[PDB]
């Protein structure tokens, strides 16, 4: 009677940057629902394709827990059919996404008075990301006609930038920890039930 390790994802001490989002593969365990919506007025909670009150009555093949951090103005991009610097170049959700999105203000954890520049995001990419694609590439982005050859110069810029989470910023700029739960159901034996 192994319980699904949901505490390791929400109560994790450090989240990953958005461009290298972490995914915890959860299966063969006793799930739960209550905490999900019942909990308390904590954060954002949006489900797509499934109802939270019905999660306890459904069995799934695998449940994927994606966790990362972005700023406030970008939480709306973690949703099916969204565009933007986060949705197109960091973490894209499919149009037929079946799952829920959870995001809370973690200004008290991930923002320092001198700026917490450890959290990074991708700024330049030649094409859009497919759903559930993780690009950790750090190659010099060629924005011009001449090749870069690993030379940071004109029309050759580094593809990552830092978030600067300072607690004195506006709420649209404060760090937000995001937890995305994907519910998959394919031709397989279902193991992630919650009763």
């Amino acid at each position, epitope marked *: 009677t192994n319980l699904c390790p949901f505490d390791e994802v929400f109560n994790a001490t*450090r989240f*990953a*940057s*958005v*461009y*290298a*989002w*972490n995914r915890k593969r959860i299966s063969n365990c006793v799930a739960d629902y209550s905490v999900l919506y019942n909990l308390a007025p904590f954060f954002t909670f949006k489900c797509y394709g499934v109802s939270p009150t019905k999660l306890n009555d459904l069995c799934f093949t695998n449940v994927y827990a994606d966790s*990362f951090v972005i700023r406030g103005d970008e939480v709306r991009q973690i949703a099916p059919g969204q565009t933007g610097n986060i949705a197109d170049y960091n973490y894209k959700l499919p149009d037929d996404f079946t799952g829920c999105v959870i995001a809370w203000n973690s200004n008290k954890l991930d923002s*320092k*008075v*001198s*700026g*917490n*520049y*450890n*959290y*990074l995001y991708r700024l330049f990419r030649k094409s859009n990301l497919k759903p559930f694609e993780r690009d*950790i590439s*750090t190659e010099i982005y060629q924005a011009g006609n001449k090749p870069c050859n*690993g*030379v*940071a*110069g004109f029309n050759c*810029y*580094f593809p*990552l*930038r*830092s978030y*600067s989470f300072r607690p004195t910023y506006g709420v649209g700029h404060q760090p937000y920890r995001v937890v995305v739960l994907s519910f998959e159901l394919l031709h397989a034996p279902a193991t992630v039930c919650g009763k």
Partner: antibody
Amino acid sequence: EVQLVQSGAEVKKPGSSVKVSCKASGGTFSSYGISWVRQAPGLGLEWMGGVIPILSAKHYAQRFQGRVTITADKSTGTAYMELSSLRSEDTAVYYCARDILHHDDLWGRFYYDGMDVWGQGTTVTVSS
Amino acid sequence: SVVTQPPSASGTPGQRVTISCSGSSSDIGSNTVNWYQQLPGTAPKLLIYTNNQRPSGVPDRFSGSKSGTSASLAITGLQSEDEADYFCAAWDESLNGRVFGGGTKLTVLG
């Protein structure tokens, strides 16, 4: 091959502030971070803070967090370090070095992984 | 502070020495460790940078290693010019910054 020349030695009174420069020969910023490390007489090394120009980023060490400023003027290609509200214990040699960067892709972070080229150091003395 | 080094170290010329560096999860737990050599009066120079990578100008007599929360530097074939201060350092994240070891003074007997 480039060299890091820092500003001359400094002597200050407790309460004042000091600003040490560190010239970067040409485009040293490209794929190279910069750290500021001081060393009291007869004591060990102490990381103060750093900066990454390609990421337009900078961090500070707990100890000096709230009394330090690190700038990087990319037009001149140089860095600065200003420590205010100086005390007698701040008497040390302040160093400036380029850090080769490591990419921890597992956690999506970018931190300093050793500093090969060093400056010649700047002696700063604080006495009433 | 978390990183720890023995204060002093001795080694017969031509033989091998090991300098130990002890840490935690907040530094060596998820970050690389490097080593610096400083001669008295001069400025430190880089010796090892990614646990056991050597810069240009550092001979293969120096070898690094990292195991869990501890690190070690090995010097084979001790020479007179190796008598100096040796510091280990890793990017600790709890404090958001590099942390240097206490240092280890090396004495060549001859």
